[PDB]
């Protein structure tokens, strides 16, 4: 309705909204505005990625309209407010961000064009042999690299994500004797509707009792003090109150339990039974696998088979494949550096 501040909206501006605003105000032709609108949607909240170019060209359905037309227009779009916008590959991002250094920057212009244009793939590790490639030495190259490292990446300045999306918790786990104890914190027609409320008010009091109950059984199923969490099956919680698996997983999926470590509520009931006599499921396998891979490789061992042998020494019956596959995942440099 009106005359009050109903949550009508804010109409904030994202990056694509703002870029399109910036396109509205620039001297594009009828067609070039179609290519521009075609590119600004391709852009991402991350900036740099304008995804595939030749799909931008082919998306228009031929009829002339070469590659060069989208290329020029593309450059000009890449030139709008947040300096380096879009482009591709980060290389051209840093070349567009480097396009304006005012040209009055000492030593930076040339060196920066050489480093940023080409050979930047080898600049990851360190200088080393690159120092011999560009003939530079001492701090001449190091100061240019200070500028290159001073650039930042793409957009993510427009952002428009003021919403942190907090957790709000649901049930509090007051820590007891090296464990956890639940408390669960935080005329006649409508009169007959009043009655439904009595039932809703009676169920509202038991809503906390379900959280404290399932929470108590969840604390009894997995040891808190132990590394990760003891392996459990939904059949235990389904054994206690005799509730269906999907229902319990739904309650733990919706609500989020706050313990002293982890905010992480439905992950405390999901585990494997390992299917082995000698033995914390995949939690400690992948967790402690990445932990053992954290301190290792004095220089560049890059050996996942040695880590698989170390896992087999612990009595987990490693397959040298599964263990290495789960260990090398999630950004793990293992086996990649070989």
């Amino acid at each position: 309705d009106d005359e009050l501040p109903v949550y009508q909206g804010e109409t904030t501006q994202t990056l694509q909204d703002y870029l399109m605003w910036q396109v509205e105000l620039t001297p594009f032709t009828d067609t070039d505005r179609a290519i521009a609108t075609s590119i600004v949607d391709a852009v991402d909240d991350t900036g740099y990625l304008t995804i595939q170019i030749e799909d931008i060209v082919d998306s228009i359905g031929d009829d002339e309209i070469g590659l060069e037309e989208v290329e020029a227009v593309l450059k000009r779009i890449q030139r709008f407010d947040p300096v380096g916008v879009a482009a591709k590959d980060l290389r051209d991002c840093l070349l567009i961000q480097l396009s304006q250094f005012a040209k009055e920057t000492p030593w930076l212009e040339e060196a920066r064009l050489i480093i940023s244009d080409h050979l930047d793939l080898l600049a990851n590790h360190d200088f080393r042999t690159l120092m011999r490639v560009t003939r530079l030495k001492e701090e001449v190259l190091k100061e240019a690299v200070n500028l290159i490292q001073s650039l930042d990446x793409x957009x993510x300045x427009x952002x428009x994500x003021x919403x942190x999306x907090x957790x709000x918790x649901x049930x509090x786990x007051x820590x007891x004797x090296x464990x956890x104890x639940x408390x669960x914190x935080x005329r006649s027609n409508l009169q007959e509707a009043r009655w439904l409320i009595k039932s809703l008010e009676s169920a509202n009091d038991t809503l906390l009792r379900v959280s404290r109950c399932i929470v108590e059984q969840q604390q009894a199923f997995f040891e808190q003090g132990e590394e990760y969490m003891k392996p459990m099956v939904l059949a235990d919680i389904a054994q206690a109150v005799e509730m269906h698996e999907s229902t319990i997983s739904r309650v733990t999926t919706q609500k989020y339990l706050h313990s002293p470590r982890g905010i992480x509520x439905x992950x405390x009931x999901x585990x494997x039974x390992x299917x082995x006599x000698x033995x914390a499921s995949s939690t400690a396998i992948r967790a402690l696998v990445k932990k053992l891979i954290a301190a290792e490789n004095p220089a560049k061992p890059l050996s996942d088979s040695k880590l698989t042998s170390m896992l087999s020494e612990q009595g987990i019956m490693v397959a040298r494949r599964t263990v290495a596959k789960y260990r090398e995942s999630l950004s793990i440099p293992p086996s990649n550096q070989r």
């Binding site: 501040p5 009508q8 909206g9 804010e10 109409t11 904030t12 509205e24 105000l25 740099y48 590959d89 980060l90 930047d120 793939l121 600049a123 990851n124 590790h125 290159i148 490292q149 930042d152 990446x153 993510x156 300045x157 952002x159 994500x161 003021x162 942190x164 999306x165 907090x166 957790x167 709000x168 918790x169 509090x172 914190x185 935080x186 005329r187 006649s188 989020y256 706050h258 905010i263 999630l330 950004s331």
Partner: protein, 1341 residues
């Protein structure tokens, strides 16, 4: 009277002729005494918690034989102080604990009890306590709770003023009003029949409600009417005579009394023929038969043989009946009287309309009547009947209801049960009919006799009782087949309903509001306020214009001047000065007692009902040393009136002239000369003033300022006083006299002043010490001044040399031109502190950390931050400089060459984190005065979070160390004293500290006694003091109670000085307001022959039309006030002797007729006089109380002593042209204020901003950048001009046309200025919303 101490630093001069008797009271007192009576142990049981415990306990369960009871309450001590609690943001309260005895008994065994057990205490809720000053701190906010004035319980009557039926009548309706429960309202019909309404129900017959009382129709009519008699035996037909019962009638036949005619047919009915038959003894006489035909039978009459059928009741007798009753042999016949002059035949027509007079039919009729549909179950009837009134607790009118119910019906006993009864309602109907009969009048609802005040005691007790009953309906279920776990007063009580109800009240409630913290006098006047609104009544817009008006009983109870001028007008009132309140909740006001024609100094508080009976004199009247009135005819008040009476008639007198006026207005000089409405503004404007850097004492004033200041509790006042040991800006200690002290505590008193602190209105609170050092202080003297206080006076504005005269149109209308001097000298410069908070919390994606370092952010921006990331204390911050930085991680960035490449090049720069930080709001400014940083336990905060830890720890250690230095000095004095008797080493004993290792054994007596006492007391004080430091230390290192979804907390304070500009909104006490039009250079102002320019120039043309002449008299006396200080200035500046200075000040103080202030010098000597004179160098502060104030004559007299012209006008010169103005001009000191309206807060301006999702229009207001409602009248005005393009771009392009706003702005940027109007969103919406009903609306081409 030698005054006291700080008072002798500046004495105002008093012009008030009338002596004072009763001292002005505590002012605030009305808050304290309420809540002080709500927290008490009472033996009688009422008055506070005890009453809510006894309102339920003991509980009976369901046929349980076991029960539960409770014994007192007690309390805990509050965990935090008021300042701590205010900082931390925690609500300030204390634990409520109660010992409940449990009695468990055996089943089937009568009176037998198997066991009893009770918990030490059960802890239920925390009740918020009250500060000393009248506020409840709640989540670190002050919040004053407002008193409410509500229609009182008891019996009420109303004429309706016959404004309904259009014929006109008197329709007398009576409503009964309980404290809690249903309402019964008896009314009259246009056809003259009584009706019963229950809780605003459609009318019912009258005799059903009475029929519920087990009264038969015979008992109904016999009980509610006359008895009389009639007798016919063998056609003798002798009826009883009732001459006194009738004032008139028409006689159809000759009436013979004992063989002689008393009144012939058609003879005079006048009192001659009445007393003629009165003085003569006359028995029953015979009358004509035709007269009986109009009479109606009362009691049911049946024949001896047959009792069948006819004539039960309420039937006009017929000639057929005479034969039957005459043949039956009944000698006596009792019939109703019903002769209509005063009396009337009511209640009988109600029986005519009553469908059935049976009890059960009435109970079923009302039972089925309450709820619209209902089956005739018969149980609903028995339930609702006993329930809706006679239940123990269901309907309770309580003590005001019972008392006023007794005095309403004129019952002698003032005590009774809180539930109604048969005879109660019967008597109410009796009085109601009596009002119709002409005997008796109605009650005025506006009368203060009928309107009671409730304060925070009584209301907290209400909600606490509510909350407790909602517990008891639950705890009743533990013994309900909940069986036995024992351990009952632990698990059985749930504290959650009690606590949520109490903190629900104080939190959120119409009558708990944030306190007005700008001004002391704003504080005060908030905390004595009586509102008609809220929970208990007066929904407003529907109230009507009669509760607005001043009624004659508000005389010295509320105030007729102080009231909001806004559309709640007369609704929100303010207590008058000397007003108080009874135990029953009624306003009573003091009076001096006059016996014979001498005025005794005994005072009596009279209530509004008590007051009207008597005669009361006038506040300002004459009098003699003996105490007799000078004038023989004295103007007095009686009842609703006023007029002159004789000397011997009046028994009372008004105490002081301040009685009518409220404290707000009691401050305004010359309030007589002001019109009341204009007085009415200015009283309101002194609230919304704003305290400035240096506080100037008002130079002319009422005398009231000392009370307000020191009562308001914004000043620091010295308890138990003595000489000042140590002084400083933040701290002031008093070494108390040896006289007042608690033995064994010894020690001194410390006072920590509060430095710069946001107020609820984002203004400074600052205390600055008045006292010097090495100065004696008595109890009650002010050590510091709060803001807008000078040496214990209330100083809300500044004095300004004013000139009345138009000046080039710059002061036009109500505007106001000011010398640049004023702006240079920084009066009117006011501080403003603003809070901003940063909180760092746990998300789904993991925890958030604060600072060092951030993605995508320059070193430039980060230069003002710390190692920890909070800004250095002291930084100047503007615009979107980063006050605290903070990082929020995003989801799972893994692989592919570009991601690994950015992570390799830049080191990922913490990768998924974002930029989320505490940047300053755009368009705000100021230095960072303080940072708090509350953390979490076990977060391992380190960094700079520890600086406040060490800081507060050093402050606490330094504050405690003083008592150890003084007590250790005393113990060292005893040890140093005992060593003199024997083995005295003199200096060698002083140069060897630490007991000189006991100085061996000395004598055995000194060995055991001196070593035991010295070592014992030494180790106990050392270990105890170190223990206090360890407990406090454990209190320092910890983290607060806090939400599960928050990790660590930081708050930053900013301060800005704001400088007056031409948006000032300056005012004066007299309802004077304006803006600042211009700031002139100094040479451009008008100046006098000595070259002193006026500060501020104001427009004479204000003053006649508005008729506020306080202004003018203020100026003149102000002029004369400066004059004396100029004499003294010039005198001390010439290094005159003390004697002559003494002579001129003494000669100044003593001027005027009467004036009752006798201060004279020679009592205080040498300095003390030099002191004050230097204290009054800047002007002499003359003080004119409200209606006894200074006369013109005294002002000219005072003014001639200053060699100023008597007329108060002076030649002034133009500043530009140098030319004399023709005609003299009034110049004078008037005392100005700066109001809380500043344009910095006002000027907005937007071009294109954010819109609304639906309707797509710009947002509401500034801060959010509204654009500016262009409303229906504004369109009408354009249409009227016929300018349709301007109107068309308003409607569309610049609000809801989305494509057209874009095209518009793009063409503007390009210089096209063309519209391309489209169709506004909001129309489209409407078309969907009408399509949402089954109506199509489509636009047809």
């Amino acid at each position: 009277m030698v005054y006291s101490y700080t008072e002798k630093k500046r004495i105002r001069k008093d012009f008030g002729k009338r002596p004072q008797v009763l001292d002005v009271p505590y002012l605030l007192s009305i808050q304290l005494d309420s809540f002080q009576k709500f927290i008490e142990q009472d033996p009688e049981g009422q008055y506070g918690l005890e009453a809510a415990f006894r309102s339920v306990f003991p509980i009976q369960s369901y046929s349980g034989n076991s029960e539960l009871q409770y014994v007192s309450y007690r309390l805990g001590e509050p965990v935090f102080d008021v300042q701590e609690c205010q900082i931390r943001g925690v609500t300030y309260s204390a634990p409520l604990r109660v010992k409940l005895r449990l009695v468990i008994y055996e089943r089937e065994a009568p009176e037998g009890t198997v066991k009893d057990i009770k918990e030490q205490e059960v802890y239920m809720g925390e009740i918020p306590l009250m500060t000393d000053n009248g506020t409840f701190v709640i989540n670190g906010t002050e919040r004053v709770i407002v008193s409410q004035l509500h229609r009182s319980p008891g019996v009420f009557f109303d004429s309706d003023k016959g404004k309904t039926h259009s014929s006109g009548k008197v329709l007398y309706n009576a409503r009964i009003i309980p404290y809690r429960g249903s309402w019964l309202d008896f009314e009259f019909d246009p056809k003259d029949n009584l009706f019963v309404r229950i809780d605003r129900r459609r009318k019912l017959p009258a005799t059903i409600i009475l029929r519920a009382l087990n009264y038969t129709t015979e008992q109904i009519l016999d009980l509610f009417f006359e008895k009389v008699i009639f007798e016919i035996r063998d056609n003798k037909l002798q009826m009883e005579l009732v001459p006194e019962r009738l004032r008139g009638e028409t006689a159809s036949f000759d009436i013979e009394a004992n063989g002689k005619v008393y009144v012939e047919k058609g003879r005079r009915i006048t009192a001659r023929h009445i007393r003629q038959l009165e003085k003569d003894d006359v028995k029953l006489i015979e009358v004509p038969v035709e007269y009986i035909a109009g009479k109606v039978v009362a009691k049911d009459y049946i024949d001896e043989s047959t009792g069948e059928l006819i004539c039960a009741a309420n039937m006009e007798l017929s000639l057929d009946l005479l034969a039957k009753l005459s043949q039956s042999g009944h000698k006596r016949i009792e019939t109703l009287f019903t002769n209509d002059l005063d009396h009337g035949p009511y209640i009988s027509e109600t029986l005519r309309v009553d469908p059935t007079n049976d009890r059960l039919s009435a109970l079923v009729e009302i039972y089925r009547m309450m709820r619209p549909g209902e089956p005739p179950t018969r149980e609903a009837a028995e339930s609702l009947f006993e329930n809706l009134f006679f239940s123990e607790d269901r309907y309770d009118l309580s003590a005001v209801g019972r008392m006023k119910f007794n005095r309403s019906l004129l019952r002698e006993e003032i005590e009774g049960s809180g539930i109604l009864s048969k005879d109660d309602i019967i008597d109410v109907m009796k009085k109601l009919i009596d009002i119709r009969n002409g005997k008796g009048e109605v009650d005025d609802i506006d009368h203060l006799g009928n309107r009671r005040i409730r304060s925070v005691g009584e209301m907290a007790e209400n909600q606490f009782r509510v909350g407790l009953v909602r517990v008891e309906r639950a705890v009743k279920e533990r013994l309900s087949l909940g069986d036995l776990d024992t351990l009952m007063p632990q698990d059985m009580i749930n504290a959650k309903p009690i606590s949520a109800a109490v903190k629900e009240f104080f939190g959120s409630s119409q009558l708990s509001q944030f306190m007005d913290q700008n001004n002391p006098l704003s504080e005060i006047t908030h905390k004595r306020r009586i509102s008609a609104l809220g929970p208990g009544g007066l929904t407003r817009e529907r109230a009507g214009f009669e509760v607005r008006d001043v009624h004659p009983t508000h005389y010295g109870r509320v105030c007729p001047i102080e009231t909001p001028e806004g559309p709640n007008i007369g609704l929100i009132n303010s207590l008058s000065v000397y007003a108080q309140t009874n135990e029953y909740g009624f306003l009573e006001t003091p009076y001096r007692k006059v016996t014979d024609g001498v005025v005794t100094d005994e005072i009596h508080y009279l209530s509004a009902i008590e007051e009207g009976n008597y005669v009361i004199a006038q506040a300002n009247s004459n009098l003699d040393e003996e105490g007799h009135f000078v004038e023989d005819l004295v103007t007095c008040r009686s009842k609703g009136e006023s007029s002159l009476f004789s000397r011997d008639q009046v028994d009372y007198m008004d105490v002081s002239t301040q009685q009518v006026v409220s404290v707000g207005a009691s401050l305004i000089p010359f309030l007589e000369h002001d019109d009341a409405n204009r007085a009415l503004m200015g009283a309101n404007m002194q609230r919304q003033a704003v305290p400035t850097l240096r506080a100037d004492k008002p130079l002319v004033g009422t005398g009231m300022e000392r009370a307000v200041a020191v009562d308001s509790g914004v000043t620091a006042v010295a308890k138990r006083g003595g000489v000042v040991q140590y002084v400083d800006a933040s701290r002031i200690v008093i070494k108390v006299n040896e006289d007042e002290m608690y033995p064994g505590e010894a020690g001194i008193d410390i006072y920590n002043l509060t430095k710069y602190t946001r107020s609820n209105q984002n203004t400074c609170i600052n205390q600055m010490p008045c006292v010097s050092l090495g100065e004696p202080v008595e109890r009650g003297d002010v050590l510091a001044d709060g803001p807008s206080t000078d040496l214990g006076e209330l100083a809300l504005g500044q004095n300004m040399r004013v000139a009345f005269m138009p000046w080039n149109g710059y002061n036009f209308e109500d505007s106001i031109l000011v010398s640049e001097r004023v702006v240079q000298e920084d009066r009117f410069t006011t501080i403003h502190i603003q809070e901003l908070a940063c909180v760092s919390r746990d998300t789904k994606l993991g925890p958030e950390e604060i600072t060092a370092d951030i993605p995508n952010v320059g070193e430039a921006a980060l230069s003002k931050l710390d190692e920890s990331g909070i800004v250095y204390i002291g930084a100047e911050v503007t615009g979107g400089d980063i006050l605290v930085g903070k990082v929020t991680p995003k989801g799972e960035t893994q692989l592919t060459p570009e991601e690994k490449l950015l992570r390799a090049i830049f080191g990922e720069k913490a990768s998924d984190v974002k930029d989320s930080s505490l940047r300053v709001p755009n368009g705000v400014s100021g230095t960072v005065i303080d940072v708090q940083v509350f953390t979490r336990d076990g977060v391992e905060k380190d960094k700079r979070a520890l600086e406040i830890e060490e800081m507060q720890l050093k402050q606490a250690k330094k504050d405690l160390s003083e008592e150890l230095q003084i007590l250790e000095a005393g113990l060292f004095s005893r040890i140093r004293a005992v060593l003199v008797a024997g083995g005295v080493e003199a200096e060698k004993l002083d140069k060897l500290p630490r007991d000189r290792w006991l100085e061996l054994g000395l004598t055995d007596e000194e060995k055991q006694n001196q070593l035991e006492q010295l070592a014992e007391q030494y180790d106990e004080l050392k270990h105890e003091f170190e223990k206090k430091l360890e407990a406090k230390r454990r209190k320092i290192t910890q983290g607060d109670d806090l939400a599960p979804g928050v990790l660590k907390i930081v708050k930053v304070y900013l301060a800005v000085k704001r400088r007056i500009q031409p948006g000032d909104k300056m005012a004066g006490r007299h309802g004077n307001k304006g803006v600042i039009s211009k700031i002139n250079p100094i040479e451009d102002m008008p100046y006098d022959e000595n070259g002193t320019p006026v500060d501020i120039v104001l427009n004479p043309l204000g003053v006649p039309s508005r008729m506020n002449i306080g202004q003018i008299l203020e100026t003149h006396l102000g002029m004369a006030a400066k004059g004396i200080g100029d004499k003294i200035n010039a005198m001390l500046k010439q290094q005159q002797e003390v004697a002559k200075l003494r002579e001129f000040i003494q000669r100044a103080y003593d001027l005027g007729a009467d004036v009752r202030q006798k201060v004279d010098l020679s009592t205080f000597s040498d300095e003390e006089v030099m002191r004050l004179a230097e204290n009054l160098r800047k002007g002499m502060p003359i003080a004119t109380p409200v209606f006894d104030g200074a006369k013109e004559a005294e002002i000219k007299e005072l003014l001639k002593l200053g060699d100023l012209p008597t007329s108060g006008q002076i030649r002034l010169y133009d500043g530009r042209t140098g030319e004399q103005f023709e005609r003299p001009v009034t110049v004078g000191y008037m005392y100005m204020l700066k109001l809380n309206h500043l344009v910095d807060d006002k000027m907005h301006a937007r071009s294109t901003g954010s819109y609304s999702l639906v309707t797509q229009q710009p947002l509401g207001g500034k801060a959010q950048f509204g654009g500016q409602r262009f409303g229906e009248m504004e369109v009408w005005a354009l249409e009227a001009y016929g300018a349709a393009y301007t109107l068309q771009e308003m409607l569309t392009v610049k609000s809801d046309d989305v494509n057209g706003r874009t095209k518009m702005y793009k063409n503007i940027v390009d210089g096209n200025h063309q519209m391309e109007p489209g169709m506004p969103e909001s129309f489209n919406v409407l078309l969907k919303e009408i399509r949402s009903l089954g109506i199509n609306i489509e636009l047809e081409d």
